[PDB]
């Protein structure tokens, strides 16, 4: 019954909001889960949340940072044997239009949106290939992927690579027979510390001309579709795009 | 348990995916009436899945308008009232646009097409407003987002019912109706319309079309389906599922 | 320079609106032109208000008439020649959600807005393969083949199917050396009679929330990249989507 | 028509010395256009502005697109020659050939400074000195189909055209919404024969099989130029946001 036993993930960002929500899933999916975050002091309160030692763990690391990822790799090796799982969900936002993006901002979106995801993407492929882990490497995208956002313009490019990168990625995969799968979740707007902190973001986005269902989603929705990617259920789902998001793209 | 209260109706469930779809169902709790137009194999997938206190059929031609009503009356008769509608009973044509007959064109949309949209229209109105945390799931194919050359029928059909679907969510989101409205593409899949095909399964396992080197299995396809039918995709509405082996990734 | 030159093309509901103009514009890029519609009063003005019968003429058929489609194209090619374009224009309406679309209204507006793009374009692919004519088959979908209106039910589903049998007619045309290429095209909202006959659609229309640009476009804007399709520039474009809807489909 | 398409437009096409922008520059020109082309190189871009006409119509500029303080400079001069610009094509674009896997974090940079960072650089930049003139401004982003669907063997280059992808969909929208008189589309080349696809053995047989392009050939550079026309008129006025996909199949399948 446990849909996820044996698996052991890596959640970068997974210390609030929907990376939180997705390692608290996994968790009681029979996960071990390794989350990530730049603040020491949120993290290990947000993993002692979730559960001890045995099934969780906290690491600091900026997804942004290329050699932490290999030493996040090895200290999740120690801690719960081999890493079947990367959720590269670590993000951050940028309430600028293209015109108004200074190249500072744009160079400090990019790093963590694409970057990182990137960095984990490259090492999951190169630590988890060819062991017969049935392994998943699920990149947070956003429906910023699959649409633009006037006020997003950095956001935007980064998910839009989030979401093909990913494709060449799943793609190799499968060619060559690794036992990786690769996919892009989508989320609409979530109840999340980003979306609380950006002043009447929620109820912008409840405007039925944005979200059809009059609200914004609560983290456990993404987290139930990350589950199913990091599942064997999805053993033929690779390379696709999996979005949640109240009808806000379907017009 | 994922699927705890649903009661659930399942067209064209008595083989390949539709069978597999009920299996799953059943397997997380919901209650399922499978259709199809042969009773002898209806009875047979029915009660190899379960008693007829989860699971049970009824023979309905998907394109019969009039047996739609018929089949959520026995349904609600017999479970209670229907929560969530597979719209998954469908035909294959091979052929081309040019060379394809009227008479093919018309009888493969009348199940392909207008069968999802008696289901999906009758599911709106019986489902609606009633807090079942409803879910209408219509099965699209990977002939929904990319075109086959020989396949023209059938990539109509399911590009109809990719975009049909999306109207469905929206006008239910809108008014609040409590029913979601969602796609799924399956990419090849081992399934007696595959088996019966001479050498589809060896041509669509050619990396040049399924990037994995193999198609996939009906629940590959149930799986995704029992998460559009459970509330843990309560915020999903109006979107396309893919499941195709990287198919369409390239 | 004619970009059409030597063309010889049917656009079907070429009496007003998009259709009107697309003529319009075919003859004034070279092309020699049949256009149809139902009512015949309409028809023979709008084929005079372009030209003569040495450039352009009117035939009434009715688009979802299988057989009418065959004398057509016989009445076309006895008139200018081989056809070698093929505008599937003719369309309707029905401000209907699926929920409320009685199976007659689902009926009519499929027989004109499927069924007769899939006889043009079956027939059109018989008639121009294999005869060095550059030929083109240009298919008016929608943005709503694209996301859905929760009032346009059957709509939908007529511009989702005629968004993808193309893309079948155009892979079998292209691997089998037809010389036919066939595309579609998604306009946005467009100021025409079926949209000034709803009452309310060019402001709802023209809402930012729908499109972008704060207004509807006009039938130009599709003749324009009609022409594109129809002429030798687009040889290499087959299968594809071409969206004129002032940013509509981008957010 | 009987009319110049272009007339009275003044175009940057970025990377315009070779390949595709070469026959964007040209058919700009043809159709009445001043251009301006950039590359890296010299002695290639003084070559191609003369092979299509005199420096009343075309001239060369020498600038990287990663180059953020060139592209003012860029503009500065494209104005004194030929005055206020009214087109970006941004077209300047490098490949990779390496899996995700096998990409090195050099070869990410370099051809995401190139790609991505130049593209952003000029649209923002002609967003900044087009709006609100009456121009009919038109920002054309050279993506791919490589921005559509994966490719094994090209995952920098895919990260960079999916970015170019949505991208040019904020800026179109922010410009319709603030009545700015610029439209931002992105166009969408299968392969076309190029010095880049010439450079890559065996590129051009492995694009040119059915299962990769139905029409079984690549395609060839008046192909993309003849949509930059389209795109860069003043026929294409509605047209914002959207992806022009002129590829021989290849993403129909
Ligand atoms: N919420 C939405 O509406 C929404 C919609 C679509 C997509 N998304 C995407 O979903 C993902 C999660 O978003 P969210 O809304 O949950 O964000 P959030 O509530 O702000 O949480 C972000 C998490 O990422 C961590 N993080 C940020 N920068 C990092 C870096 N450089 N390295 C490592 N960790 C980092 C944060 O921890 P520290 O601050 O301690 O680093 C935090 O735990 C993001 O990729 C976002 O783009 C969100
Ligand atoms: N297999 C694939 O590779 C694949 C890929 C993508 C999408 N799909 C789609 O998935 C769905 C299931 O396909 P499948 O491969 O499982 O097909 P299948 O093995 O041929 O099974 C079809 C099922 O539908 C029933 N059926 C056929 N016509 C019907 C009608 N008019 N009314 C009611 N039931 C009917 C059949 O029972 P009776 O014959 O007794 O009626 C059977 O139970 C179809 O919509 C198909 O288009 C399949
Ligand atoms: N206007 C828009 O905003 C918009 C947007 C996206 C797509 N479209 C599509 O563009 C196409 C043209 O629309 P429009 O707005 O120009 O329409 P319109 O102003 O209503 O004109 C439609 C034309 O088609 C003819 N027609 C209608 N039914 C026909 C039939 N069964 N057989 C032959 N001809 C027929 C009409 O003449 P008779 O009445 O005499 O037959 C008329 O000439 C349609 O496919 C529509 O779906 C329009
Ligand atoms: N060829 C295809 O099949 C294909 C398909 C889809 C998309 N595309 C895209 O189309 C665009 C043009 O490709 P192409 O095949 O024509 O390439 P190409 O034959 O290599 O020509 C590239 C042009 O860009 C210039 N360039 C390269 N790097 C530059 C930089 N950093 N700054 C300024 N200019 C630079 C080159 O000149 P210097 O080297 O002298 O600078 C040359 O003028 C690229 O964005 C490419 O991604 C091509
Ligand atoms: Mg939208
Ligand atoms: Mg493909």
């Known amino acids: 019954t446990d849909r996820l036993k044996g698996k052991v993930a890596i959640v970068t960002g997974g210390t609030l909001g929907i990376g939180l929500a997705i390692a608290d899933k996994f968790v009681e999916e029979g996960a071990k889960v390794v989350i990530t975050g730049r603040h020491a002091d949120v993290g290990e309160k947000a993993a002692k949340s979730i559960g001890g030692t045995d099934v969780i763990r906290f690491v600091q690391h900026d997804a942004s940072d290329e050699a932490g990822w290999t ?15 990367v959720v590269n969900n670590a993000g951050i936002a940028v309430s600028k239009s293209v015109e108004d993006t200074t190249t500072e901002e744009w160079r400090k979106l990019l790093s963590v949106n694409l970057d990182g995801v990137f960095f984990g993407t490259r090492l999951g492929i190169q630590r988890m ?13 956003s429906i910023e992927g699959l649409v633009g956002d006037p006020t997003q313009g950095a956001y935007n490019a980064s998910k839009g690579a989030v979401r093909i990168m990913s494709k060449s990625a799943a793609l190799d995969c499968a060619l060559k027979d690794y036992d990786v799968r690769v996919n892009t979740v989508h989320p609409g707007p979530i109840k999340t510390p980003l979306v609380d902190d950006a002043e009447g973001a929620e109820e912008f986005f409840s405007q039925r001309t944005k979200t059809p269902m009059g609200h914004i989603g609560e983290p456990n929705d993404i987290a139930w579709i990350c589950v199913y990617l990091a599942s064997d259920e999805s053993k033929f789902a690779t390379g696709a795009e999996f979005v949640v998001d109240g009808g806000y793209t379907a017009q």
């Open 71 to 85: 030493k996040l790799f090895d200290t999740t090796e120690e801690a719960f044997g081999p890493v079947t799982t």
């Open 129 to 141: 290939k060819n062991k017969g882990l049935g392994a998943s490497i699920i990149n947070m995208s």
